[PDB]
Design an enzyme around this catalytic site. Structure first.
Site, mmCIF file in Angstrom:
data_model
loop_
_atom_site.group_PDB
_atom_site.id
_atom_site.type_symbol
_atom_site.label_atom_id
_atom_site.label_comp_id
_atom_site.label_asym_id
_atom_site.label_seq_id
_atom_site.Cartn_x
_atom_site.Cartn_y
_atom_site.Cartn_z
ATOM 1 N N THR A 1 27.984 47.897 52.196
ATOM 2 C CA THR A 1 28.169 48.594 50.935
ATOM 3 C C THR A 1 27.336 49.873 50.844
ATOM 4 O O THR A 1 26.126 49.865 51.076
ATOM 5 C CB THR A 1 27.849 47.685 49.738
ATOM 6 N N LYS B 1 37.845 50.522 49.218
ATOM 7 C CA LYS B 1 37.094 49.269 49.118
ATOM 8 C C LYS B 1 36.687 48.958 47.679
ATOM 9 O O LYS B 1 36.760 47.805 47.248
ATOM 10 C CB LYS B 1 35.850 49.307 50.009
ATOM 11 N N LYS C 1 55.303 35.680 28.101
ATOM 12 C CA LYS C 1 55.562 34.351 27.561
ATOM 13 C C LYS C 1 54.439 33.375 27.941
ATOM 14 O O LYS C 1 53.903 32.682 27.073
ATOM 15 C CB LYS C 1 56.934 33.831 28.010
#
Lengths: 277, 278
Positions: B92, B167, B243
């Site tokens: 990251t 990402k 629904k």
């Protein structure tokens, strides 16, 4: 073996019925459109003249438009069904409709069962559906073998109504995640990315990881405690989730896209995982 | 042919680097933790003495904890790597981090690529990962055969930074959908249902249908015209969704559970699908 009936040969009804032609008990089918029924005849289904005609079956399946149509069909079957006959409803109904119909027909030994299914016509054809069933335990046990012919996963959800309630939880996840997917696509597009490529990554990786169901590994919603083996790993995932969500929200602001599902998720994730701050 | 380097042998780095021992180029690994190194040693990887040692490789993979650590490793590599070296970042980072290091290292003719991965350690060991790669066209083509060895799906998302951004979109969906799963679990429990069974149904049916990704089959986010091949299917999906969501929201009122993600989904689904109400 149970002789089968099927009423309503729509986009899920037809394939389940087709799969039931492979059942040695055989299946008698009905639908008002000649074209829904012709292919079932070709697949070896016995064609019935009327709804009342199908009532001779031991286990009668119903997949029609709405509650109103289900009541209408159940009411017509009830006039002719012999004691011990099971009626399974697979199409969309309120859980109270199942409770009501089962309640009204119990005294005549006509067993109503709500058995919504998931997911897909193709799976229906191959007998790989999941079904979530509300029934008397005794009734569930007698029909399980029949259900297992067209469903790879058969859950006894509880009493009549419980099947519907489990389906509503399951499908709330499905459609909330579809809304989330569309939000991800709006962000990707504002970032100048190929949405179809993103879609390919998502589908490939969810086949590897299992998808949203991957996080569903808790048997209650109590907050996790440090002695739980699940604790540190969920703490870890919370950190990851909060990091990635904040990074995405910052991108959203950078490319002028509103991300309200992500924002809600970011605020609620910790508490939902059972590891609040 | 490319000689490989791997820095960071954690829960994702190790299985990736282990897969790379089967690459004909071979892999040279480094992690400060000896217990991370030894398994890779007995899988046939060469063991570097330092991050500076790893810089000899043609294609250097980095999977570490956070931005700060990524910046440091590449900073250490930058003084030792030969011109034309490629550095692939898999852990990251912010999307501006990839761009910055790319600009930083243009001097040394060292190439930066952000190539985040998804999903799973098991996939990583089998060479079945997805990777989303931000890279200049020429360096993408140079490394694609190498990536194909450990990734079954290799996307060229764009220039450096584009991988990160794909990402972020992908993982936004992951974690928003986990949030939704937990909300579903809260509903199921208040309604007296078995959570183990609910999970089994979810995972089974998502194997069949493809999951949330099944709806991600559009080129752009324009509204669907009536003759669009996806129009009638998506309209049908809008009908089913509204629904089921409405029924789910009513059940939630009945068992005293707040379903805020579902409420928001209910209001926005039609628009998100590109079939809004008129």
């Amino acid at each position: 073996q149970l002789k089968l009936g099927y009423i309503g040969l729509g986009n899920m009804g037809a394939p389940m019925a087709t799969r039931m032609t492979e059942w040695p008990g055989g299946v008698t089918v009905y639908d008002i459109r000649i074209e829904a029924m012709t292919p079932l005849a070709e697949a070896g289904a016995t064609l019935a003249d009327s709804v009342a005609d199908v009532a001779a079956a031991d286990l009668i399946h119903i997949t029609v438009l709405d509650d109103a149509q289900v009541r209408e069909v159940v009411g017509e079957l009830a006039g002719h069904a012999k004691p011990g006959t099971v009626i399974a409803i697979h199409s969309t109904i309120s859980d109270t409709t199942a409770v009501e119909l089962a309640r009204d027909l119990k005294a005549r030994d006509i067993h109503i069962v709500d058995a919504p299914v998931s997911g897909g016509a193709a799976a229906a054809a191959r007998g790989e559906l999941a079904t979530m069933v509300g029934a008397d335990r005794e009734v569930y046990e007698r029909i399980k073998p029949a259900f297992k012919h067209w469903a790879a996963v058969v859950i006894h959800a509880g009493e009549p109504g419980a099947g519907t309630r489990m389906k509503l939880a399951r499908n709330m996840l499905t459609f909330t995640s579809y809304a989330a997917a569309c939000e991800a696509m709006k962000l990707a597009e504002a970032a100048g990315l190929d949405l179809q490529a993103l879609g390919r990554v998502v589908r490939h990786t969810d086949a590897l990881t299992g998808g949203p169901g991957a996080i569903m590994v808790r048997d209650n919603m109590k907050d996790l405690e440090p002695d739980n083996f699940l604790y540190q790993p969920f703490l870890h995932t919370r950190g990851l989730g909060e990091k990635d969500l904040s990074l995405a929200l910052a991108l959203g602001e950078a490319v002028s896209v509103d991300l309200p599902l992500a924002r809600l998720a970011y605020e609620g994730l910790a508490a939902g995982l059972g590891v609040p701050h």
